[PDB]
Design a protein around this ligand. Structure first.
Ligand SMILES: [Cl-]
Ligand SMILES: [Cl-]
Ligand code: NA
Ligand code: NA
Ligand code: NA
Lengths: 172, 172
């Protein structure tokens, strides 16, 4: 049924933050919070990006600002990030944080640890991207995380995010 | 340079309205205004949708509400719609308005007048979609329009939309 798309929610226990993640990473898309790159990069051209929890690379851009990704540098290996779709909570664990140049489009490849691959991805990653350093845009801070758990919503919210209440729709 | 994406602006002389069109048509995407379907439908599966002004079908969803697409039914054959990207104003002219069921995904095919084609589109269309009737969501009101003019922004705005000023970025 038109329009058919869903949004997701992102939760970060470590910074005590969460958002509805919109589609797209244009200036109007991420004006007020994080957005999902709709396409992943490959050497042979752009392909549809992974949806939440799915094999590939669910990549997100957000401004380096108080209400969004200012504190992304506080994430360390092992930290949990939770992505929520209409059916599940997906827990990812941070496996890497690094700094790259603005043109390092490889970080949004379906497998960011093998960006030259042309094969279908098998692992599910989550990537968070923002400007770096603070108050500069010379570089990008990148956090990659790997799926460790899929929890159907029928079982309720994970304890570490259960206090992060909405104000009022992921689906039409 | 990450993130690399641009948004567009849509202008409708007839209803004296304009918006920044976001990416995506999820509930959070189109909460406040129209959004672009990132993929077009074909019988063989979803493909990347046309960008503004480009061959294919630039399709937009917006709620049937005062600040968005309430008055889309006022558009008639011949009426102009303007889509603006970073470089050009694209004028489209309405060729058809019709009502379809919610599952008529063909309206977002690259060529909505030949939805079963799997060949590359050659014509540039703009499609506006909203709920129909007024105060119901049983159907969809669809306006299809065809590209008639490409004006580079260096030449300034078309006369019929030159009074539609912003408050403030289509690109990062
Ligand atoms: Cl810093
Ligand atoms: Cl009506
Ligand atoms: Na957001
Ligand atoms: Na959006
Ligand atoms: Na909009």
């Amino acid at each position: 049924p038109l329009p058919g798309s869903a949004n997701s929610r992102l939760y970060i226990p470590k910074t005590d933050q969460n958002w509805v993640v919109v589609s797209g990473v244009g200036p109007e898309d991420i004006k007020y919070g994080p957005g999902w790159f709709p396409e992943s990069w490959t050497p042979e051209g752009m392909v549809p990006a992974a949806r939440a929890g799915q094999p590939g690379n669910y990549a997100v851009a957000g401004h380096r600002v108080a209400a969004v990704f200012w504190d992304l540098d506080k994430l360390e290996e092992g930290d949990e990030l939770v992505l929520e779709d209409a059916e599940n909570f997906y827990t990812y664990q941070v496996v890497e944080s690094k700094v790259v140049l603005p043109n390092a489009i490889e970080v949004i490849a379906p497998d960011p640890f093998n960006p030259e691959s042309t094969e279908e991805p098998e692992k599910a990653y989550l990537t968070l991207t923002t400007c770096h350093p603070k108050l500069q845009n010379s570089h990008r801070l990148i956090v990659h995380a790997e799926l460790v758990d899929t929890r159907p919503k029928e079982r309720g919210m994970p304890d570490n995010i259960a206090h992060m209440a909405p104000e009022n729709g992921l689906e039409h």
